[PDB]
Design a protein around this ligand. Structure first.
Ligand code: SF4
Ligand code: SF4
Ligand code: SF4
Ligand code: SF4
Ligand code: FES
Ligand SMILES: [K+]
Ligand SMILES: [Zn+2]
Lengths: 48, 51, 125, 114, 106, 84, 688, 95, 207
């Protein structure tokens, strides 16, 4: 890379990170989608 | 209709993009039939009976 | 030498299926309806057997669709309704058969588009 | 209705094969418990054998009975020669599976399965 | 180069994946763009065959040059879209150069 | 413990339902006049055995076969239910 | 007799005269390629993809438009035919955009699939492509018109099926553009069908946009419950979620179309859902609880009440399995106040005779009628696919249509006789000139909408309309087997309710207000707490929190129609069944199982524990309810007319005005459509 | 951009965030929630609209055969800009 | 010689056809159909009673000499009343030729074990029994070969589910591996791939 540096992009990490497994920085999977079914919320007033 | 187009053709030609799309989703159809085909594999005769 | 066996064919005990997936299941024997998004009719030739849909739920870790139904993806193809019904009976599945729906023959006439006195006259082409 | 037999020509001949298989399983249970060092008793093992024979008591097709006996002999051979391991023997007892109540209400509370 | 995602949720990679390792959901983005809301790769299902990157029409999903990412838990190998995008931002300098060297054989 | 509902099932064309078809065509209008508040549900279905169903209080039901019944036998059968 | 012999690749086939070359190939099982041709639209012959060689003819013919001639041999696979398909396909793809990855049609595209089968495998077009601007035609159909291949299917469908002459072509040559020229929305009740018939991704569904690919969806064949037509549908699901609704071909019901409410209201199934049993706490607020706690509270009240103290109202989306289960449960406390929200006059025969409340001519029968008399109804919105069938007969058989009621727009011209209900008496007595038309007709059809029986003089209007139909039949000139009198229903659950013996309307509940009320998905607002004793115990079973749930003492979450296998009887009396596409959400349960579970806890166990057994119960009460897809005939109109004359009623001086006058009233008519955000967009679009 | 819920959990570019009372956020305790900070919807909006002199312009995303399939964009409407459906670059026809 | 098209070898097609009717003439008691595909493979379809006579003749006859059993497999076609098609692929070193012999059976009908003809057939028949449940009469030692001990069912049947009915895990309470009903965190996603447009007119079936 001294002779042929890589093409710069503004979204490329400026700071490389090594393998973070086993540490508090480890990746934890999760679902990236929002809740699919919306539940009816009952009224807050008494009327019955 | 069997082998996918080159990527540069896939990105310029309408027919190539269609065929790339279909080959990588449905895949090519194979005419009905059955074959036993064998080769001289390193361990001996290796064959498939493909229907 | 051939022997006479007069009972109905019932292989439920030698197929290895669990009991809950013989008596609780409902097989549907049908010809798939044409996908309305396309005009081709080649997916309406053969009969199909499918089973009732059971629960799918979200995986707590990833949100994937989990199932406990081993027959959820099982689809069988048959040449005729009779073949599908015979297969269901010998396996012990209760089934619903649905008649094949064939498109009705139509009277098409290009010349009707320009009728002298009828309503079939088109206003544009 | 003229079909090629497997072994038995009729249910009377088939039931004889069943009885011989039952004797072989009945005799073997004490050996299975001792060899595999199971923590069930010979009575439990023999009750289970009886349970497996009972579930097929309604068969009236000699060919189906013949195939059930053939598989029974294969299963017995796997056990006698210790091809099966303790895990395979104990799978008949479903020890780790929780009861699923069969009443309408109990199913109704837990899910949509009939 | 602008920073917009290349993936337009065509699901060709998901369709071709021999292992069914890819899971995708998509919807119109708030600006109307055709973009994914889910893009998971189960790295314990994946067979690292590269069919997904062959199938991708826009060079969105790639197999990069990293092979040193073993983990201490199974769950750490279930990648979601955030992980995969971070991988792209982490490795883009090498990935772009590797694609430059080989795209004329593709 | 009284009567609550009467249901008559029959085929539109089978000869076994001819007497019931006659009874409806002839005597049903007068039956409904006598019991204006009594649901008498006549339900035709192809290739069914004709039957008379009576529902009494608290959901007790009994059915009576009208197969190959004359219009007179049908009248008697209904009379038993309306009475007994 | 007049069949002429032709040959397809040397194989003889006998066809009626007028059969096209395309139709002749169908008879031997060969499907000629096509784009512009649709068998339910007028022949266009502009795409040229159907070109086929006739043996010994130097020029290939358009198979979709050319009638066959005796002795012709059609070479569907000749090199001449193949080279024609490649040429046309190459012209179709010259200017077509490289959009498949971002195009919703990808995977179920006729252009893709026929390019694969009939086109070449590469391109020799070395120019720049055409680009066309897109056009807004409402919130339901997205237009990416650069993908349009100018097949004119949308134009023909809009004119001929939907009866709307807004779509057309502007310009000419390569710059010819499909659209509306001006800015206009295509908001017909049948508008969504142009998504299906458009062969490419030019017209797609906005709600569905980008959400799925065709290969990954599972297809559940089911029945629509948004109306009483009973349209056959396919429910597309993926990974446990409903993705879209498509039509399913049924010649005798919906052909291959569905209404916009059928197509686009499914998104109301993801909102305002009941997912957990609820009871009232100590402050009078609804609180989540278990099925055990919730059913015990209901069972306790059910055990302390009898007779008239207990009633039930079934709503519009209730299935027959739940209907009979709830009837059996109430009958076991000696209650018979089983009511529906949708009124039907009980005078005379009432619901004793099926012919009294059925579309006896059937939907397909409209094609054989020569006069139709529509009374007090707006079939366009009440039953869009039945109205489409009338326009089909109007267009193709020169059917004469007259309407007594408001002068609504039915997408075809009709004779508006006025709106006064008294006009019916004039027709019956011969004073009105239209009485001559009915006598002359060989197959008249009088259709009385259920909307008009919701008035207070409904029995009078039914008696008047029935009187008209009696005079026609009596005076002869109508074949014996032809049925004349019809009722057009708008509620999915109505006919199964009347078949099982439910009382139509809540009039019974108004006379003797109960102490315990079961609201079985009843969200019309017919009964509120103003009409009930102050301490009335109200149990709501349903799938949406809409109108009935907020006033209930107990909420039992049930399954929507996409989530159960349930029986629905359409306006012809034809029974059909849905299938489970996805399971109910949360703690929701199948509806007849809730009632069956309640019966056990209350000690009145119903005698059926499976779906098949409860369907055996349906057979004991009305045997037609298990004859799926069969239209069981109903007779004895003479007896019904006799009993209808006994008690005379006065017609009201109020003109017949249907509930739905314009499109804006069509989109939200039930709990599911009211919860649909897409249906809310449509209402906004047609009122702003 | 990347917001935080009232609980402090970052909201992703897909809008995901566990609501309070969702037990599943326990999976982040002692660890972290992987969130990509470069929101593509924000990045693309930063691009300037390109002015062109023709009614139709083509976009391949840049880089020749390293971009996306080449598409042609109509610029006849002055009520808005033409947007590439693959990459989101905007174009306008000048006068 | 079009570069992308497989060439035709007409000499082989003629040779295999001639030998095809040669076998039909000699064993008419059993042979039901003889065909040669467009890629020159000869198939003999026989009544199952002729498994031993036909295979013995092909192995031993001086004009056949099919000494090697290359492969013995089964195919499940549920729409047939005899759902299982048994396929013998044989090789002749003397004449440098291959031949396929096919027969049929159902769930309850035994097929004669061909071990007396080809010792290779021993394990192939065990596999067919294991994966399809076809019983071979007079097999020296017929038992499962591929599936787990005590496994229930025949996985290669079309109606056996892809993921089976039971799965395994280690249970700490009983200190052993146990079997339980199968639940998948991610259900297999069924894809509907077939295009609704016919691909090969040459194979169209009559309506
Ligand atoms: S490399 Fe992995 S994710 Fe990509 S197609 Fe192959 S198995 Fe699927
Ligand atoms: S990564 Fe590529 S192939 Fe996969 S969905 Fe996105 S654009 Fe399509
Ligand atoms: S209409 Fe068909 S061919 Fe055209 S871009 Fe869409 S999927 Fe591709
Ligand atoms: S929009 Fe679709 S249906 Fe209409 S002319 Fe264009 S391709 Fe045909
Ligand atoms: S299908 Fe005949 S020209 Fe279009
Ligand atoms: K379309
Ligand atoms: Zn671009």
């Amino acid at each position: 890379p001294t002779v042929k540096p890589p093409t710069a992009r503004k979204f490329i990490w400026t700071n490389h990170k090594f393998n973070l497994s086993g540490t508090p920085q480890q990746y934890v999977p999760y679902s990236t989608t929002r809740k699919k079914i919306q539940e009816w919320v009952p009224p807050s007033t008494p009327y019955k | 209709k069997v082998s996918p187009p080159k990527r540069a053709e896939m990105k310029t030609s309408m027919e190539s993009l269609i065929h790339h799309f279909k080959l990588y989703t449905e895949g090519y159809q194979v005419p009905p039939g059955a074959t036993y085909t064998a080769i001289e594999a390193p361990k001996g005769e290796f064959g498939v009976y493909l229907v | 030498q051939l022997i006479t066996v007069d009972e109905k064919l019932d292989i439920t005990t030698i197929t290895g299926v669990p009991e809950e997936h013989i008596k609780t299941r409902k097989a549907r024997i049908f010809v798939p309806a044409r996908n309305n998004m396309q005009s081709g009719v080649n997916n309406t030739k053969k009969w199909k057997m499918e089973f009732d849909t059971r629960e799918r739920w979200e995986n707590p870790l990833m949100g994937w669709a989990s199932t406990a139904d081993p027959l959820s993806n099982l689809v069988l193809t048959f040449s005729t309704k009779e073949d599908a019904v015979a297969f269901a009976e010998k396996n012990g599945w209760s089934y619903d058969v649905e008649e094949r729906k064939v498109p009705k023959p139509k009277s098409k006439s290009y010349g009707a588009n320009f009728s002298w006195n009828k309503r079939t006259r088109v206003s544009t082409k | 209705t003229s079909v090629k037999p497997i072994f038995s020509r009729d249910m009377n001949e088939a039931k004889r094969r069943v009885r011989e298989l039952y004797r072989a399983w009945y005799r073997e249970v004490p050996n299975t418990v001792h060899l595999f060092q199971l923590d069930i008793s010979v009575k439990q093992g023999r009750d289970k054998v009886r349970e497996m024979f009972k579930k097929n008591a309604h068969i009236t097709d000699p060919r189906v009975v013949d195939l059930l006996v053939i598989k029974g002999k294969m299963e017995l051979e796997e056990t006698i020669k210790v091809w099966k391991q303790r895990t395979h023997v104990m799978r008949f007892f479903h020890e780790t599976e929780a009861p699923r109540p069969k009443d309408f209400l109990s199913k109704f509370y837990v899910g949509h399965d009939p | 180069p602008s920073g917009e995602e290349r993936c337009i949720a065509c699901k060709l990679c998901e369709a071709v994946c021999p292992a069914q390792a890819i899971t995708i959901e998509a919807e119109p983005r708030a600006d109307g763009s055709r973009r994914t809301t889910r893009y998971d790769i189960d790295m314990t299902k994946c067979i690292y065959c590269g069919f997904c990157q062959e199938a991708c029409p826009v060079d969105a999903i790639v197999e990069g040059p990293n092979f040193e990412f073993s983990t201490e838990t199974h769950e750490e190998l279930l990648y979601n879209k955030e992980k995969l995008l971070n991988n792209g931002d982490k490795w883009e300098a090498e990935i772009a150069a590797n694609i430059q060297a080989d795209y004329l054989y593709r | 413990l009284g009567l609550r509902e009467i249901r008559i099932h029959l085929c539109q064309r089978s000869p076994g339902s001819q007497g019931v078809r006659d009874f409806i065509e002839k005597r049903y209008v007068e039956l409904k006049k006598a019991n204006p508040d009594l649901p008498i549900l006549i339900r035709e279905c192809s290739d069914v055995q004709p039957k008379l169903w009576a529902r009494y209080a608290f959901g007790q039901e009994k059915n009576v076969s009208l197969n190959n019944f004359s219009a007179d036998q049908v009248t008697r059968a209904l009379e038993n239910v309306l009475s007994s | 007799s007049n069949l002429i012999e032709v040959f397809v690749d040397g194989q003889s086939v006998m066809v009626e005269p007028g059969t096209t070359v395309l139709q002749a190939c169908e008879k031997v099982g060969m499907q000629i390629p096509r784009f512009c041709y649709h068998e339910r639209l007028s022949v266009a012959g502009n795409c040229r993809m159907c070109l086929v060689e006739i043996e010994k003819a130097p020029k290939v013919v358009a198979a979709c438009a050319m009638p066959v001639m005796k002795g012709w041999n059609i070479l569907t696979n000749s090199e001449k035919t193949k080279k024609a398909r490649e040429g046309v396909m190459e012209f179709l793809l010259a200017n077509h955009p490289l959009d498949c990855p971002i195009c919703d049609q990808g995977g179920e595209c006729d252009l893709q699939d026929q390019s694969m089968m009939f086109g070449s495998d590469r391109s020799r077009f070395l120019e720049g492509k055409r680009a066309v601007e897109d056009k807004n035609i409402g919130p339901l159909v997205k237009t990416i018109m650069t993908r349009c291949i100018q097949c004119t299917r949308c134009i023909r469908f809009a004119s001929e099926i939907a009866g709307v002459d807004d779509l057309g072509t502007t310009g000419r040559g390569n710059d010819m553009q499909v659209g509306t020229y001006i800015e206009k929305m295509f908001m017909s009740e049948l508008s969504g069908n142009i998504i299906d018939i458009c062969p490419v991704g030019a017209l797609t569904s906005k709600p569905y946009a980008f959400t799925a690919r065709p290969w990954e969806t599972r297809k559940t064949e089911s029945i629509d419950v948004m109306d009483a037509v009973g349209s056959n549908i396919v429910v597309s699901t993926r990974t446990g979620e409903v993705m879209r609704i498509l039509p399913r071909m049924h010649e005798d019901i919906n052909e291959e179309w569905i209404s916009d409410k059928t197509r686009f209201a499914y998104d109301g199934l993801k909102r305002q859902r009941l997912t957990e049993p609820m009871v009232r706490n100590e402050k009078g607020l609804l609180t989540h609880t278990t099925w055990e706690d919730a059913l015990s509270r209901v069972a306790g009240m059910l055990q302390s009440f009898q007779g008239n103290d207990v009633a039930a109202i079934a709503g519009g989306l209730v299935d027959a399995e739940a209907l009979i289960a709830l009837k059996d449960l109430l009958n076991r406390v000696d209650s018979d106040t089983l009511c529906t929200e949708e009124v039907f006059p009980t005078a005379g025969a009432g619901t004793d005779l099926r012919s009294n409340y059925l579309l006896n001519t059937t939907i397909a029968g409209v094609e054989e009628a020569d006069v139709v008399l529509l009374v007090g109804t707006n079939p366009r919105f009440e039953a869009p696919l039945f109205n489409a069938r009338i326009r089909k007969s109007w267009l193709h058989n020169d059917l004469k249509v007259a309407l007594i009621g408001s002068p609504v727009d039915l997408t075809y011209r009709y004779d508006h006789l006025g709106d006064s209900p008294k006009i019916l008496q004039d027709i019956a007595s011969g004073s009105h000139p239209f009485s001559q038309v009915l006598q002359e007709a060989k197959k008249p059809m009088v259709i009385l909408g259920s909307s008009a029986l919701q008035r207070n003089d409904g029995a009078a209007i039914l008696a008047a309309v029935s009187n008209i139909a009696q005079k026609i039949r009596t005076s002869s000139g109508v074949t014996g087997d032809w049925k004349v009198m019809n009722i057009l229903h708008r509620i999915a659950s109505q006919v199964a309710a009347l078949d099982l013996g439910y009382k139509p309307g809540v009039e019974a509940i108004q006379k003797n207000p109960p102490k315990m009320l079961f609201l079985l998905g009843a969200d019309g607002g017919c009964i509120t707490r103003q009409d009930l004793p102050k301490d009335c115990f109200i149990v709501y079973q349903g799938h949406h929190g809409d109108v009935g749930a907020p006033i209930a003492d107990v909420i039992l979450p049930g399954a929507a129609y996409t989530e159960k296998s349930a029986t629905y009887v359409n306006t012809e009396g034809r029974a059909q069944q849905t299938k489970v596409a996805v399971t109910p959400p949360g703690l929701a349960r199948e509806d007849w199982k809730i009632i069956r579970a309640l019966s056990e806890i209350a000690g009145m166990t119903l005698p059926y524990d499976t779906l098949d057994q409860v369907r055996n119960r349906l057979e004991e009460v009305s045997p037609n309810l298990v004859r799926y897809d069969d239209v069981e005939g109903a007779n004895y109109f003479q007896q019904a007319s006799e009993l209808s004359k006994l008690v005379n009623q006065q017609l009201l001086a109020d003109p017949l005005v249907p509930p739905q006058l314009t499109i804006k009233d069509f989109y939200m008519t039930d709990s599911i459509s009211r919860a649909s955000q897409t249906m809310a967009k449509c209402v906004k679009a047609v009122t702003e | 951009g990347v917001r935080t819920s009232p609980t402090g959990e970052k909201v992703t570019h897909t809008g995901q965030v566990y609501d309070d009372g969702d037990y599943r956020k326990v999976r982040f305790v002692g660890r972290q929630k992987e969130v990509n900070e470069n929101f593509a919807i924000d990045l693309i909006a930063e691009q300037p609209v390109s002015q062109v002199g023709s009614r139709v312009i083509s976009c391949d995303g840049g880089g020749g055969a390293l971009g996306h399939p080449r598409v042609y964009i109509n610029l006849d409407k002055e009520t808005k800009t033409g947007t590439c459906g693959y990459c989101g670059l905007q174009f306008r026809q000048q006068h | 010689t079009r570069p992308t098209v497989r060439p035709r070898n007409d000499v082989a097609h003629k040779q295999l056809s001639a030998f095809g009717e040669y076998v039909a003439e000699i064993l008419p008691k059993y042979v039901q159909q003889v065909q040669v595909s467009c890629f020159n493979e000869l198939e003999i379809c026989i009544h199952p009673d002729g498994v031993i006579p036909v295979l013995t003749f092909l192995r031993d006859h001086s004009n056949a000499q099919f000494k090697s059993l290359a492969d013995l497999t089964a195919v499940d076609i549920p729409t047939r009343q005899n759902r299982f098609e048994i396929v013998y692929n044989l090789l002749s070193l003397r004449f440098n030729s291959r031949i396929r012999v096919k027969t049929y059976t159902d769930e309850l009908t035994p097929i004669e074990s061909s071990v007396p003809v080809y010792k290779a057939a021993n394990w192939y028949e065990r596999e067919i029994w294991d994966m399809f449940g076809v019983f071979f009469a007079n097999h020296p030692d017929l038992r499962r070969i591929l599936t787990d001990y005590g496994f229930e069912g025949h996985p290669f049947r079309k109606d056996f589910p892809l993921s089976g009915y039971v799965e395994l895990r280690y249970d700490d309470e009983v200190k052993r591996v146990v079997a339980e009903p199968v639940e998948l965190a991610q259900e297999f996603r069924k894809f509907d791939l077939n295009s609704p447009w016919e691909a090969f007119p040459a194979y169209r079936q009559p309506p």
